[PDB]
Design a protein around this ligand. Structure first.
Ligand code: MG
Ligand code: MG
Ligand code: MG
Ligand code: MG
Ligand code: MG
Ligand code: MG
Ligand code: MG
Ligand code: MG
Ligand code: MG
Ligand code: MG
Ligand code: MG
Ligand code: MG
Ligand code: MG
Ligand code: MG
Ligand code: MG
Ligand code: MG
Ligand code: MG
Ligand code: MG
Ligand code: MG
Ligand code: MG
Ligand code: MG
Ligand code: MG
Ligand code: MG
Ligand code: MG
Ligand code: MG
Ligand code: MG
Ligand code: MG
Ligand code: MG
Ligand code: MG
Ligand code: MG
Ligand code: MG
Ligand code: MG
Ligand code: MG
Ligand code: MG
Ligand code: MG
Ligand code: MG
Ligand code: MG
Ligand code: MG
Ligand code: MG
Ligand code: MG
Ligand code: MG
Ligand code: MG
Ligand code: MG
Ligand code: MG
Ligand code: MG
Ligand code: MG
Ligand code: MG
Ligand code: MG
Ligand code: MG
Ligand code: MG
Ligand code: MG
Ligand code: MG
Ligand code: MG
Ligand code: MG
Ligand code: MG
Ligand code: MG
Ligand code: MG
Ligand code: MG
Ligand code: MG
Ligand code: MG
Ligand code: MG
Ligand code: MG
Ligand code: MG
Ligand code: MG
Ligand code: MG
Ligand code: MG
Ligand code: MG
Ligand code: MG
Ligand code: MG
Ligand code: MG
Ligand code: MG
Ligand code: MG
Ligand code: MG
Ligand code: MG
Ligand code: MG
Ligand code: MG
Ligand code: MG
Ligand code: MG
Ligand code: MG
Ligand code: MG
Ligand code: MG
Ligand code: MG
Ligand code: MG
Ligand code: MG
Ligand code: MG
Ligand code: MG
Ligand code: MG
Ligand code: MG
Ligand code: MG
Ligand code: MG
Ligand code: MG
Ligand code: MG
Ligand code: MG
Ligand code: MG
Ligand code: MG
Ligand code: MG
Ligand code: MG
Ligand code: MG
Ligand code: MG
Ligand code: MG
Ligand code: MG
Ligand code: MG
Ligand code: MG
Ligand code: MG
Ligand code: MG
Ligand code: MG
Ligand code: MG
Ligand code: MG
Ligand code: MG
Ligand code: PB
Lengths: 95, 681, 229, 631, 33, 229
């Protein structure tokens, strides 16, 4: 199946919520620039015609590969709705 | 009450022709009705096959009459019945009305008969509708034969007796789906109507009266009758059946041959030598593979394709019209406006496609040029044309292209231009253009083949002759059938056919097994007995005895209970062979298949691909005029339907967006699908 | 050499013509005859090279589904018969040879009717191409190639003459393989495998030749086990 | 078409189909690569088949990476009617489906066609491959029972491997005692008398002869031809001298390997028996709870593989000499035959009413039939343990008790058009000829069955419509609903035989307490089932076992019937079953997940007349779907 | 309204510790003069 | 070299310890991984020579099923434990070596207890033969040989000392062989066999070594097809 799906399931209060986090994480993983990632240097994502997945294959395979680690933060009301998008653009380049 | 002639093949046309249905006029029965009409009433005997009805919504409503059944003076189905005055049975016959049959004590064919003498005191008869043990002295009438109880389409099944009536139905409808193979072949075992079927149907060409043959063309056989006359007999070379299958008469008579009145000069679409052939005899091993023949899946030996075995000639017919628009006539010229000559090649004849040209999906089959907008030109498209070359042909490219799916090689074309001969061109129709395309459909994964007993499966894997199950002597098996599809279904008859088939392979002969009166287990075991010498006898003389493998499988077999412990391998394998199974070695490992596996000659047919098999797949395309949902037709595949049942599926899961998109971005949101594509782009 | 090695495999051969050829080889230690015969059988059917009709061009015929006047068989039955034709050319320089033939009048066009080609031979002379009648014109060009395995006429799509029609290519010279492992009592202990495989061949190559090539394909494959990583 | 090596996780979808479906995604990708300058270009590039540089396939292949597609079946009966897989692009026309999931969508490969959809948005993709993936929905919304299991061919494989044989018992070898008994029946077995598998209680000479030290030692001897797999040998596994068969030992490993917690692999497996679909099904359910979800998925294909493999070698096939006829059939027939003459002479006089005759005769055959059935099997059970036919039926693989009966023994009481069954049975089996009238007599009941399927293949949403119309809004959105009004589930049932309490059946209770939430505490066998605790099937196994001893008669448990959340249902009240096996996850479409589980089995239920029966004398109740309606 | 449409989860945002510090930096800036 | 030959077998190895050793090799044309793996498996189990206990003689013990005083284990478990003993000798001269051992008193007789033989080594020292108690006398002679495959103690029936008892012969250093053929993609053609066989070994020899010897036994067997007759 998929990597630590159980581990993931356990990290949320509701099944359907985990899907919302991943999807929203995959959203910004592309939009603000694909290099908005917490895990990258040594052993993060990888696809084989070269090891080229490092740049842009699947967005959420990353989201999941990240959330499975302890750096993200998914809350009900974590960072005020409109100022988040502003700060993100300010800090993440690649357009 | 009238529909397209079902001429998938000869039997189908013959069976369709003699079919009965209550659905009709209005004065006669409709659809709220059926539970007592749909059942097989008692009187249905020699009158209507129990089994031949459809499988589903229509059942009992549409039924085909029995073999010997004839509608005498006013439509009451009468069946044959011979007379038996006293303990004497006669060769005289009364076509009897369904009502008068109640009046008498009738008996079944299966009653020991010395000739005119009935032979056993308490022998069965059946009064009107109830099975009854009557005495030889009351037996007024007897049944002509088992054949009268069923239809022509059903009587063709080998040992029907051993098959669940439920599944023999599938068998009878399977045959109606039989597609003529370039390599025709009559079954290794037949019932007895194969001949009569091709002859009464009008497949093969028969000789009127006796004579000699003059010329034998691929196109004509002008025979010379001895009466001092000679007639040319054209042969419908490659004509288009309503259903696409090919109808060709291949001459079976050589130059200068004295013909016997009534003998095949040419063969019908699917006959071998006057004998019906809807499939091909093929050696088959009946075991499990690496799940390749999982529920009902069949593994096929690549070796079957090397020989043009299951290949069938089909003919699709594409057509296009030069229409008259008020914007301007649609010309049919070799001018396809926007981009290349390579694409033009095969359209050779200024316009139409050149005969004998291989046409792959997308190539131009015929070219057409219609006008661009509805009434007005285009401001943005005006500038572009000007920039690189203002003067351009301001006409649209609406040319008949090959639909996704496949084309073959053009074989014939028709063009009804102005000044028509004696044709009816419709209004607006400036001129029509037909293009016939033919393609060799080889047996490929996804195709469905099935034997006359209802084993209907689909080809899941084409194996390299290199590794499938192989016999002690080099010959490999063509098809590997899963056993698990035999217990549930109840048709041991296929397993009875494979055995008798095994004998016919080493005995080099074909047999005929009637319906309720045919081969018997002891007779079969007898022929196998003769087969053992051809298979193992040559083995003894050719120079070698038994394997480590051969002996190994014997051990596990005696521990099984198939071979009497103690007897010698030679004698042991005979016992084991008579049982219908022989030792097979896994072509991949070379090691045996622990335990004897049966193998033999089973008649398997290939079924016709309906227009549904063309693997539909649609990305973006047309849209209905009023309802704004996805619609196909000619080239762009129609969209699949997402039904409530399917809706609930998604509703059941948390699939919220997935369900939203099915309703909005995929089918109906005008603005949605638009921004949807571009977004994805 | 005298004891375990001279007790080496006595490869005895028995071959008739170019088609059939038995091959015996014993003694062999436990379960080896099988071990050998099987791979060799797997090679004999797939890896060995061959020759078969790859394309055909008939006088006035434009596609495969036509019928020629004065010719009983239809073009499809003839291109079928051509797949049955087994030719044999002697060396590499002969990659693609077009065999030529033309016959008229009441004749049974047989494979011996093709005009002789210098390095090429036809093992299948009496095979039957057609039954021409009076006024029967048939002038064709059938191509022939050297390849391996089965190649659908669809896969190659051969193009010598635009009105030509490709044929399915089947090249394994080997028609069928078979192998038996019968016990042999050589004096000490009795468990002794005795391998003997029977090879059949279209004539293009020979049983013996085929076997040789086969064992080579396996040797060459055992070599591929050299550079670890 | 079945794709045997494919993993649950994936499905083979034709490249040609993938091209059209994922065209836009492909177009763009073409521009990212040198293949096409722009979209319009890329499009024309693909407008005709002969024009595609194989670099395009590599583009498509790369596009698909990671994305998944949805597949749909003819009747979409339950949520699993649609599943998500990873496309593995393949040649040609057919779609390659995994075998395990063929249980979920009711699909056989004689011609069923499956549809396929493409989730577009990154969101749709997320839910589709996270919560809608086939590997993730393993258990069913109807019963906790596994839906995806080694179904037909795999059982068969896995069964044959694990089975022990038994042969000829002549010389009375009951070896557990003499030392001379060991020697003698060791020698005698070497001789032609005692088998390797003899009933001799402790160790038939087959165990006397071979002892295997390490695990592997056991299989090498097999490879060399010393031990068949199904043979009874002795072996020294961890800490034990276990007298268990080659095969059984191998199976132990297959699982032990599929999941490397070897000891946790032995704790949940019974090598004490041939592996049936039930032992297997159970193996999966355990594996699931016990280890982890995905690790269970590995074990599933582990089985799927060996099952397929062992299967082909076992060489089970079907010849005519396989369905064995009992020697007792001729007796039971005649004995019942002559008894039929008594009933006649008893009538010929004037004793039995015209009816009495009939009902008495049917009784005769209903029993005689039933008699040869146990007979035939008793034959296979005693004489041929390894009959291809019978084995398919005992292994959870394929075959019906009533079906085998129609091939070997006899099919015997067909009913007339109306329903009044015939007076005369069908004396034959399919082995020998089911005669003409026997055939025609048989034909009647065939149509009724066919007529019944047609009225029904008609509308499948009928029943499941009503349930989704009155139930869709119902969804789990909660905090523990604090209203504890509760329901008490019974463990004992009253009237078949008038008044005799009885432990409810095994399953029925399972379906009443499985994964429910205790309303109040319960001190049962020794353990204290705290309040609010979700009761696992293993707890639902404790309660029954306690009711067996006699400590509980009801069970306080929360439920949908006593809910306080108006348009919703809470976690504690729903219970356990998400397709998953933990509590229910908030936001689950429970309303429809219920409406479905009930709309599918309904299709198996009879369909004579809705407000059932027919006015005639005294027709008293109503069975099949007609009643579920009435209810 | 049932699946992810659940107002319970319709709203849920995601963070990187990097964007967490960035937003408190925005709040820090709120101190005037 | 660049096209068909450089596309040659990438023999990749993974071996941890002398026991386990995976061996991968791809690409391979149609149905070859199987064609190779199978014979190699048949060789790895039978031809790779080996060494294992073939007979045992205990001090005062006469039958196979007796128990020795002061010795917890029984002769059957001990002769069982001996099948677990893996020895290794250096050259032909060492066909049959009897290993000697004798221990008394509260001791755990381990394989290191056997008196050293000059041309032979014991890889299995700490293996556990017995747990002796007071008055525990145990003096035995365990034979050792070099053979191939599995030989039931019944088949050989070894005779050094009349009261001796034969042991089942486990000579293959290979414990178990495992080969898988999974598809792999090389550009244009997707049908590609990829062989990978897993070899297990007692420790006497190594997976890698075993594989080598194996391929050689097959090579040497493919030359036995040289001199007709
Ligand atoms: Mg995983
Ligand atoms: Mg965690
Ligand atoms: Mg970065
Ligand atoms: Mg990694
Ligand atoms: Mg790297
Ligand atoms: Mg930015
Ligand atoms: Mg109608
Ligand atoms: Mg009216
Ligand atoms: Mg009626
Ligand atoms: Mg049908
Ligand atoms: Mg009379
Ligand atoms: Mg007559
Ligand atoms: Mg009657
Ligand atoms: Mg009388
Ligand atoms: Mg029926
Ligand atoms: Mg029926
Ligand atoms: Mg007839
Ligand atoms: Mg003449
Ligand atoms: Mg015509
Ligand atoms: Mg005739
Ligand atoms: Mg056929
Ligand atoms: Mg033309
Ligand atoms: Mg222009
Ligand atoms: Mg018209
Ligand atoms: Mg006009
Ligand atoms: Mg033979
Ligand atoms: Mg013959
Ligand atoms: Mg037979
Ligand atoms: Mg002989
Ligand atoms: Mg002779
Ligand atoms: Mg089509
Ligand atoms: Mg299209
Ligand atoms: Mg649909
Ligand atoms: Mg000779
Ligand atoms: Mg000779
Ligand atoms: Mg000779
Ligand atoms: Mg060997
Ligand atoms: Mg050839
Ligand atoms: Mg001409
Ligand atoms: Mg023409
Ligand atoms: Mg030369
Ligand atoms: Mg050459
Ligand atoms: Mg000649
Ligand atoms: Mg030449
Ligand atoms: Mg020359
Ligand atoms: Mg010797
Ligand atoms: Mg010797
Ligand atoms: Mg070489
Ligand atoms: Mg596969
Ligand atoms: Mg595999
Ligand atoms: Mg694959
Ligand atoms: Mg297209
Ligand atoms: Mg199921
Ligand atoms: Mg379903
Ligand atoms: Mg179907
Ligand atoms: Mg969306
Ligand atoms: Mg999963
Ligand atoms: Mg559930
Ligand atoms: Mg369910
Ligand atoms: Mg005892
Ligand atoms: Mg005896
Ligand atoms: Mg006994
Ligand atoms: Mg022992
Ligand atoms: Mg014990
Ligand atoms: Mg064992
Ligand atoms: Mg283990
Ligand atoms: Mg337990
Ligand atoms: Mg038990
Ligand atoms: Mg369970
Ligand atoms: Mg659990
Ligand atoms: Mg868990
Ligand atoms: Mg295998
Ligand atoms: Mg009795
Ligand atoms: Mg009276
Ligand atoms: Mg009366
Ligand atoms: Mg059962
Ligand atoms: Mg009867
Ligand atoms: Mg009570
Ligand atoms: Mg009761
Ligand atoms: Mg009671
Ligand atoms: Mg219970
Ligand atoms: Mg309580
Ligand atoms: Mg209490
Ligand atoms: Mg208590
Ligand atoms: Mg209590
Ligand atoms: Mg208490
Ligand atoms: Mg209490
Ligand atoms: Mg208490
Ligand atoms: Mg409390
Ligand atoms: Mg819980
Ligand atoms: Mg528990
Ligand atoms: Mg009680
Ligand atoms: Mg909770
Ligand atoms: Mg009443
Ligand atoms: Mg009643
Ligand atoms: Mg401030
Ligand atoms: Mg301030
Ligand atoms: Mg290259
Ligand atoms: Mg390289
Ligand atoms: Mg390379
Ligand atoms: Mg390479
Ligand atoms: Mg490693
Ligand atoms: Mg060694
Ligand atoms: Mg003792
Ligand atoms: Mg110590
Ligand atoms: Mg020395
Ligand atoms: Mg002690
Ligand atoms: Mg493999
Ligand atoms: Mg190494
Ligand atoms: Pb609640």
């Amino acid at each position: 199946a998929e990597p630590g799906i159980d581990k993931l399931f356990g990290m949320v209060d509701s099944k359907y919520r985990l899907t919302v986090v991943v999807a929203k994480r995959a959203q910004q993983l592309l939009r603000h620039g694909f290099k908005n990632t917490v895990l990258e240097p040594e052993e993060r994502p990888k696809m084989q015609t070269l090891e080229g997945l490092f740049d842009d294959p699947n967005a959420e395979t990353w989201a999941m590969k990240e959330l499975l680690t302890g750096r993200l933060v998914f809350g009900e009301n974590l960072v005020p709705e409109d100022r988040l998008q502003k700060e993100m653009e300010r800090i993440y380049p690649g357009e | 009450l009238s529909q397209f002639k079902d001429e998938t093949n000869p039997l189908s046309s013959l069976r369709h022709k003699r079919r009965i249905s209550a659905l009709g006029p209005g004065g006669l029965t409709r659809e709220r009705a059926g539970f007592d009409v749909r059942d097989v009433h008692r009187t249905h005997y020699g009158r209507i096959c129990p089994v031949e009805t459809p499988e589903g919504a229509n059942i009992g409503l549409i039924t085909s009459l029995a073999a010997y059944a004839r509608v005498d003076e006013l439509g009451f189905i009468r069946t044959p019945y011979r007379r038996v005055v006293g303990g004497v049975v006669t060769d005289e016959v009364v076509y009897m009305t369904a009502t008068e049959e109640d009046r008498y004590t009738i008996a079944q064919a299966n009653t020991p008969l010395e000739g005119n003498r009935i032979a056993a005191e308490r022998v069965v008869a059946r009064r009107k509708g109830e099975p009854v043990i009557v005495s030889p002295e009351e037996v007024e009438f007897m049944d002509v034969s088992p054949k009268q109880v069923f239809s022509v389409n059903t009587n063709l099944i080998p040992f029907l007796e051993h098959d669940d009536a439920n599944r023999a139905l599938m068998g009878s409808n399977m045959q109606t789906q039989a597609v003529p193979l370039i390599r025709a072949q009559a079954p290794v075992v037949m019932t007895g109507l194969e001949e009569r079927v091709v002859r009464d149907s009008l497949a093969a060409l028969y000789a009127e009266e006796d004579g000699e043959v003059a010329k034998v063309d691929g196109n004509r056989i002008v025979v010379r009758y001895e009466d001092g006359r000679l007639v040319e007999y054209p042969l419908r070379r490659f004509y288009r059946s309503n259903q696409g299958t090919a109808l060709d008469q291949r001459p079976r008579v050589v130059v200068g041959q004295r013909v016997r009145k009534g003998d095949l000069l040419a063969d019908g679409p699917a006959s071998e030598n006057g004998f019906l052939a809807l499939g091909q005899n093929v050696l088959v091993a009946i075991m499990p593979f690496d799940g390749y023949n999982f529920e009902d899946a069949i593994v096929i030996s690549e070796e079957l394709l090397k020989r043009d075995f299951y290949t069938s000639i089909h003919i699709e017919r594409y057509e296009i019209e030069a229409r008259d628009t008020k914007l301007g006539p649609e010309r049919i010229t070799r001018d396809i406006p926007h981009l290349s000559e390579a694409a033009l090649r095969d359209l050779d004849e200024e316009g139409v496609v050149r005969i004998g040209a291989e046409v792959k999906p997308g190539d131009i089959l015929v070219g057409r040029t219609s006008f661009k907008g509805e009434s007005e030109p285009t401001p943005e498209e005006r500038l572009l044309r000007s920039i690189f070359g203002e003067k351009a042909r301001d006409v649209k490219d609406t040319s008949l292209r090959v639909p996704p799916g496949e084309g073959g090689i053009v074989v014939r074309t028709v063009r009804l231009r102005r000044g028509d001969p004696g044709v009816e061109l419709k209004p607006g129709v400036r001129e029509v253009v037909r293009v016939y395309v033919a393609q060799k459909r080889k047996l490929q994964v996804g195709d469905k083949l099935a034997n006359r007993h209802g084993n209907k499966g689909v080809v899941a894997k084409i194996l390299p002759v290199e590794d499938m199950p192989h016999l002690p002597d080099g010959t490999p098996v063509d098809v590997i059938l899963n056993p698990l599809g035999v217990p549930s279904r109840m048709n041991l008859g296929q397993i009875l056919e494979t055995h008798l088939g095994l004998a016919g392979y080493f005995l080099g002969q074909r047999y005929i097994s009637p319906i309720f009166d045919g081969a018997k287990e002891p007779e079969i075991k007898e022929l196998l007995a003769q087969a053992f010498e051809v298979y193992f006898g040559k083995r003894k003389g050719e120079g070698f005895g038994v394997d480590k493998r051969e002996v190994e499988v014997l051990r596990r077999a005696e521990k099984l209970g198939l071979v009497t412990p103690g007897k010698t391998p030679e004698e042991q394998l005979k016992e084991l062979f008579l049982q219908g199974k022989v030792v097979l070695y896994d072509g991949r490992t070379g090691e045996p298949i622990e335990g004897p596996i049966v193998v033999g000659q089973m008649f398997i047919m290939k079924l016709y691909h309906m227009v549904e098999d063309k693997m539909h797949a649609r990305s973006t395309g047309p849209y209905s005029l009023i309802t704004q949902q996805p619609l196909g037709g000619k080239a762009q595949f129609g969209g699949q339907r997402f039904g409530e049942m399917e809706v609930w599926a998604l509703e059941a899961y948390g699939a919220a967006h997935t369900l939203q998109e099915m309703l909005t971005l995929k089918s109906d949101d005008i603005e949605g699908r638009n921004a949807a594509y571009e977004a994805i782009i | 050499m005298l004891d375990s090695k001279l007790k080496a495999p006595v490869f005895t051969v028995r071959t008739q013509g170019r088609e059939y050829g038995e091959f015996v080889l014993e003694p062999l230690e436990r379960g080896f005859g099988v071990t050998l015969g099987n791979p060799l059988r797997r090679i004999l059917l797939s890896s060995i090279p061959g020759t078969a009709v790859t394309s055909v061009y008939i006088e006035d015929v434009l596609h495969e589904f036509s019928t020629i006047p004065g010719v009983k068989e239809d073009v499809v039955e003839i291109i079928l018969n051509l797949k049955e034709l087994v030719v044999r050319f002697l060396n590499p320089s002969l990659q693609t040879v077009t065999l030529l033939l033309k016959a008229e009048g009441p004749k049974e066009v047989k494979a011996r009717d093709f005009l002789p080609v210098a390095d090429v031979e036809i093992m299948n002379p009496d095979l039957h191409i057609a039954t021409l009648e009076e006024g029967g014109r048939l002038n064709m060009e059938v191509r022939v190639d050297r390849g391996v395995g089965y190649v659908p006429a669809e896969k190659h799509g051969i193009k010598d003459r635009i009105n030509a029609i490709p044929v399915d290519a089947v090249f394994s010279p080997v028609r069928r393989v078979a192998f038996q492992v019968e016990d042999t009592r050589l004096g000490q202990r009795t468990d002794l495998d005795k391998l003997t495989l029977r090879i059949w061949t279209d004539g293009s190559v020979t049983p013996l030749e085929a076997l040789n090539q086969a064992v080579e394909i396996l040797r060459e494959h055992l070599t591929y086990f050299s550079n670890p990583q | 078409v079945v794709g045997p090596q494919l993993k649950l996780h994936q499905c083979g979808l034709p490249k040609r189909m993938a091209l059209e479906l994922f065209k836009p995604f492909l177009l763009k990708k073409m521009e990212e690569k040198g293949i096409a300058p722009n979209v319009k270009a890329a499009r024309r590039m693909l407008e005709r088949q002969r024009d595609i540089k194989d670099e395009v396939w590599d583009a498509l292949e790369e596009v698909i990476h990671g994305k998944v597609v949805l597949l749909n079946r003819a009747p979409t009966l339950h949520r699993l009617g649609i599943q998500a897989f990873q496309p593995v692009l393949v040649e040609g026309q057919s779609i390659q489906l995994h075998p395990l999931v063929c249980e979920a969508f009711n699909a056989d490969f004689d011609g069923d066609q499956m549809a396929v959809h493409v989730p577009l948005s990154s969101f749709a993709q997320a839910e589709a491959r996270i919560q809608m993936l086939s590997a993730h929905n393993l258990l069913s919304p109807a019963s906790g029972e596994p839906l995806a299991k080694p179904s037909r061919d795999i059982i068969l494989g896995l069964y044959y491997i694990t089975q022990v044989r038994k042969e000829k018992k002549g010389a009375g070898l009951e070896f557990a005692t003499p030392e001379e008994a060991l020697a003698a029946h060791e020698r005698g077995e070497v001789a032609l008398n005692a088998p390797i598998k003899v009933a001799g209680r402790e160790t038939s000479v087959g165990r006397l002869k071979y002892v295997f030290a390490n695990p592997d030692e056991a299989l090498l001897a097999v490879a060399h031809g010393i031990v068949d797999l199904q043979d009874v040998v002795t072996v020294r596994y961890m800490g034990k001298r276990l007298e268990t068969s080659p095969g059984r030992i191998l199976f132990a490993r297959i699982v032990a390997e599929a999941v490397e917690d070897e000891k946790v692999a032995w704790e949940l497996i019974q090598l004490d028996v041939p592996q049936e679909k039930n032992s297997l099904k159970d193996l999966v359910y355990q594996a699931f709870l016990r280890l982890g979800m995905e690790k269970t998925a590995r074990l599933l294909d582990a089985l799927k593989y060996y099952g397929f493999t062992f299967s082909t070698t076992s060489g089970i096939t079907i010849g005519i000499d396989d369905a064995v006829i009992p020697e007792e059939k001729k007796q039971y027939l005649e004995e019942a035959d002559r008894k039929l003459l008594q009933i006649e002479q008893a009538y010929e006089m004037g004793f039995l009413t015209d009816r009495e005759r009939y009902d008495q005769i049917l009784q005769l055959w209903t029993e005689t039939t039933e008699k040869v059935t146990q007979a035939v099997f008793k034959n296979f059970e005693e004489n041929y343990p390894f009959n291809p036919l019978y084995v398919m039926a005992q292994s959870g693989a394929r075959g019906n008790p009533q079906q085998i009966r129609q091939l070997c023994g006899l099919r015997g009481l067909m009913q007339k058009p109306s329903g009044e069954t015939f007076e005369v049975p069908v004396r034959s089996s399919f082995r020998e000829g089911l005669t003409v009238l026997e055939y025609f007599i048989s034909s009647h009941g065939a149509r009724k069955g066919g007529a019944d399927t047609a009225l029904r293949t008609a509308d499948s949403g009928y029943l499941t419509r009503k349930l989704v119309d009155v139930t869709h809004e119902i969804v789990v959105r909660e905090a523990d609903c604090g209203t504890t009004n509760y329901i008490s589930v019974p463990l004992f049932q009253p009237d078949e035989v008038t008044r005799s309490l009885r432990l409810r059946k095994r399953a029925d209770i399972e379906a009443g307490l499985y994964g429910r939430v205790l309303a109040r505490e319960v001190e049962v066998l020794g353990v204290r089932l705290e309040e609010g605790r979700y009761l696992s099937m293993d707890d639902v196994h404790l309660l029954i076992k306690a009711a067996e001893a006699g400590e509980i008669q009801e069970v306080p448990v929360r439920s949908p019937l006593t809910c306080q959340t108006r348009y919703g249902v809470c976690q504690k009240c729903y219970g356990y079953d998400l397709s998953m096996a933990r509590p229910v996850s908030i936001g689950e479409a429970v309303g429809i997940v219920a409406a479905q589980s009930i709309g599918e089995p309904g299709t198996q239920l009879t369909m004579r007349t809705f407000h059932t029966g027919g006015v005639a004398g005294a027709a008293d109740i109503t069975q099949g779907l007609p009643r579920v309606i009435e209810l | 309204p049932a699946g992810t449409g659940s107002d319970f989860v319709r709203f849920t945002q995601v963070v990187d510790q990097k964007t967490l510090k960035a937003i408190e930096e925005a709040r820090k800036e709120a101190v005037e003069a």
